[PDB]
C-alpha cells in the first residue's frame, strides 16, 4: 500500500482489505478514536 | 508530500478529481461515473 509506485486518483480512490496478518505499525498521522503509539 | 515521486516538469495528468457534482457524497461512497 505504502510503497506502490502509482496511487489511484482521488475520484476513484483505492480501497484494500487487510486480513489474517500481523499488523506491525513500527514500519510506518492523525488518529481518531485511538492513539498511534498504542496501535501495536 | 510526494514531490520527488509525482512532480512533473510539464504537468502530471494521472491524478483526476471530481470538481462538480449534484449532491455531496455519502460516507465511504465512490462515484466513478
Amino acid at each position: 500500500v505504502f510503497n506502490a509506485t502509482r496511487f489511484a486518483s482521488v475520484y476513484a480512490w483505492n480501497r484494500k482489505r487487510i486480513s489474517n496478518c500481523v499488523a506491525d505499525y513500527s514500519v510506518l498521522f492523525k488518529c481518531y478514536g485511538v492513539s498511534p503509539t498504542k496501535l501495536n | 508530500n510526494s514531490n520527488k515521486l509525482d512532480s512533473k516538469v510539464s504537468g502530471n495528468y494521472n491524478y483526476l478529481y471530481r470538481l462538480f457534482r449534484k449532491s455531496n457524497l455519502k460516507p465511504f461512497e465512490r462515484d466513478i461515473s
Binding site: - | 512533473k8 510539464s10 494521472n14
Partner: peptide, 29 residues
C-alpha cells in the same frame, strides 16, 4: 508488474524499463 511501469503505463503497449510509472516521475526517471 508490466502495467505499472513505462517502457506511459496508461499510454497517455498491452498492459494485459523506467524506474517510475510514467514520465511524471521526472525526479526518479
Amino acid at each position: 508488474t508490466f502495467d505499472d511501469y513505462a517502457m506511459s503505463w496508461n499510454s497517455g503497449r498491452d498492459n494485459a524499463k523506467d524506474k517510475t510509472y510514467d514520465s511524471p516521475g521526472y525526479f526518479l526517471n
